């Protein structure tokens, strides 16, 4: 009855950040030491929880959200941040409680010009944990777009130019955000204790 963190962290394919993936961890024993004791992570920033004190506390649910961004943008996957990713792709709440784990994936998501996407145009900021997969032509002016691309009428999604020879800030990073939900319900996710 072990929690399926391996399916999330070790997935061969990862989602684009605008279409970010969410795994609902429920009814299992999680051992977080596989995570915080590993040496493969470029970034491991937790908020309101310490990953070392988790292995004997119980939660109603855990969410593992995964996607791919670029290194310069990893600092946006945090409470109280702004930027294209935090505003229009993936938004953490200010009261966020959980961990943001990220590692360089240049050896897996760069080829010789892969196809990961981010949302570039949006009229307003995303709500926390909102997922917008719309592809409606973005209207930058007064004229309606009528589903045709043109001046002031832009396709909302853009492709990362992921090339192996990019600077580290333009290289792909895989990101897993764990967030811990403890409603007033049966707690189904526990540490080995």
């Amino acid at each position, epitope marked *: 009855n072990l929690c399926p963190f391996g399916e999330v962290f070790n997935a061969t394919r990862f989602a684009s950040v605008y279409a970010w993936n969410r795994k609902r961890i429920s009814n299992c024993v999680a051992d977080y030491s596989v995570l915080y004791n590993s040496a493969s992570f470029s970034t491991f920033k937790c908020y309101g929880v310490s990953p070392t004190k988790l292995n004997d506390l119980c939660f109603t649910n855990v969410y593992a959200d995964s996607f791919v961004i670029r290194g310069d943008e990893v600092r*946006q996957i945090a409470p109280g941040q702004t930027g294209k990713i935090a*505003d229009y792709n993936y938004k953490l709440p200010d009261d966020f409680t959980g961990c943001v784990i990220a590692w360089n994936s240049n050896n897996l998501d760069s080829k010789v010009n892969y196809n990961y996407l981010y949302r570039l145009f949006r009229k307003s*900021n995303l709500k926390p944990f909102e997922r917008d997969i719309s592809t409606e032509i973005y209207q930058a002016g007064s004229t309606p777009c009528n589903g045709v691309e043109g*001046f*002031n009428c832009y396709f909302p999604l853009q492709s990362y*130019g992921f*090339q192996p020879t990019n600077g580290v800030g333009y290289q792909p990073y895989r990101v897993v955000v764990l967030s811990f939900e403890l409603l007033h319900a049966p707690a189904t996710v526990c540490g080995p204790k």
Partner: antibody
Amino acid sequence: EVQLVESGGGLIQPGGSLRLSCAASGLTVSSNYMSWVRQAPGKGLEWVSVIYSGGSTFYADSVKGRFTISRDNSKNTLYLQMNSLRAEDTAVYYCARDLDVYGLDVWGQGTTVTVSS
Amino acid sequence: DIVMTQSPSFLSASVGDRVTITCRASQGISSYLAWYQQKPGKAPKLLIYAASTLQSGVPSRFSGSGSGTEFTLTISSLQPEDFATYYCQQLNSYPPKFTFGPGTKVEIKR
């Protein structure tokens, strides 16, 4: 026919303040990445400020804390409030629409700000 | 921060010549580059985005190429109107730092 016309530039003493306006026609300011880019006399282009449609703002390190970008959707207008001005801030100030991957495609014709006693 | 340089600083060529200006980035920035033309006193005019895509309404003699660390703007046949300072700029910085290049002043030889 899209135009951006800026205004509010002129002579101002060091330490003074100054508000630049940029009226737009042919695009909606509140729906666009809008930026201020300046050019000191005889020098190159220096990005100053940007505001996102969702409201996020960002500034260059040289004007951080002293400049504030803003907008008014009712008037379809972008604003650059400049405080604690120094002679290094003397420049032509351009208003521009950023398309991020497609570049800064629409520019105003600039407004000149001289900081001198 | 990533540094943008340009070469040469000044250039003179005859009408009809094939002009080539170079922009270099301190680190590989893929295709995230734009090219602008600025006449003295006037506002910059966007020529190239995405390192190679020609902006709509820009004469076909202007072309852009490169990716990673080195980029070139190429005027296939220099025209009298083409004298100006040409700037390159790095796109999609985070935190946003719309870094421009030093510029290349192109003068018409006759």
